Design a protein around this ligand. Structure first.
Ligand SMILES: c1ccc(-c2noc(C3CCC3)n2)nc1
Ligand SMILES: c1ccc(-c2noc(C3CCC3)n2)nc1
Ligand SMILES: [Ca+2]
Ligand SMILES: [Ca+2]
Lengths: 204, 204
């Protein structure tokens, strides 16, 4: 009975790990395809499964961080979202903190995604008329040539500036989608997806 | 691309079905062991996975109904819970409606669980001093000899009546646990649990 309950709890922990890996892969794919409602529903499922887990491997922690980063990016234009206990941190600033904390290579793509997040963290404030908040975001990020151009835009209140059209929200999203594409290749071999794919393939 | 996206969606639907079956089995077990917090957390996970599904087999629908019934039983003493759009229906009345709707055998255990739910649906109202609400519950359920005894208890306001001690909340719970024990034997062979058990067994 004591050994049996321990065996069941261990099996439930192995099953939860598989469900987490599956849901994290499904979330990345929904983000890549632009399936917004599927992303929202799958994020709810991932969060509930996490609250039912007590141990995470380093790989599962990295995976969770990537999903958290994608969640903040999707809500980048939702300034009413409070992702941190400090209520002044905007969603794109929260995504920037996680992007600089994930144990991943700092290749050219990493740095471009970082700089696109920094420019947009200011742009989304200006696009709503929150000019003082844009200055506060700027001071918290910067904490150049790139630095002084952005401060000049904030002071001039030039919301629809051509600089924000070159390094746009669409460009930031596309570069983040390219990264998600590499992640999706790595996780497409997780236990749950592989066994589900074999069942579908066997009925064709 | 069009065929590939269809294959992925089918595989995700097969994986979700496995996760639902696993979570429903885990919920029944937590209910049986009296692990209240695990029941609460696993119910949240089951609900989120259901909102991500669009097709359910008859077996999966029956399983969902059993979990819904267990959720109402656990909140039987929480009169502030509103499980139906009709705000007057108490949690035990909601459990009674589902128990009479599940496609299952109406054996001796089924009927005893039904009658224990009916007696307790009144008892939990009286135990809180809600004597008028107990009369309304009584009229919605009854809708005897059993019938006239209960009405006499409601009118006399005898909350701590010996009748409610013979057919008690503990007795209703134990009989429901015996039923859950039969369900647990049937579902202990689901795909996710079987493959998780084999991984744990292979490391001993
Ligand atoms: C997508 C990915 C992850 C989450 C999440 N919620 O809480 C947590 C815990 C912080 C340590 C794990 N992760 N929510 C959505
Ligand atoms: C445990 C079991 C099931 C549920 C649940 N929530 O919504 C539903 C839908 C009604 C048709 C399926 N089921 N919640 C907890
Ligand atoms: Ca705000
Ligand atoms: Ca009430």
């Amino acid at each position: 009975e004591e050994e049996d309950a321990g065996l069941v709890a261990e099996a439930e922990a192995v099953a939860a790990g598989w469900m987490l890996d599956f849901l994290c892969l499904s979330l990345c794919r929904a983000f890549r395809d632009g399936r917004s409602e599927d992303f929202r529903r799958t994020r709810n499922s991932a969060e509930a499964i996490i609250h039912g887990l007590s141990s995470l491997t380093a790989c599962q922690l990295r995976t969770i961080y990537i999903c958290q980063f994608l969640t903040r990016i999707a809500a980048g234009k939702t300034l009413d979202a409070q992702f941190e206990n400090d209520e002044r941190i905007t969603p794109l600033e929260s995504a920037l903190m996680i992007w600089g904390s994930i144990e991943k290579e700092h290749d050219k793509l990493h740095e471009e995604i970082q700089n696109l997040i920094k420019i947009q963290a200011i742009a989304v404030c200006m696009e709503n008329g929150n000019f003082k908040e844009a200055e506060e975001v700027f001071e918290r990020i910067f904490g150049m040539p790139f630095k002084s151009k952005l401060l000049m835009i904030i002071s001039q209140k030039d919301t629809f500036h051509s600089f924000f059209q070159h390094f746009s929200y669409n460009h930031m999203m596309e570069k983040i989608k390219s990264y998600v594409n590499y992640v999706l290749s790595e996780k497409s071999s997780t236990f749950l997806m592989k066994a589900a794919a074999k069942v579908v393939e066997s009925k064709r």
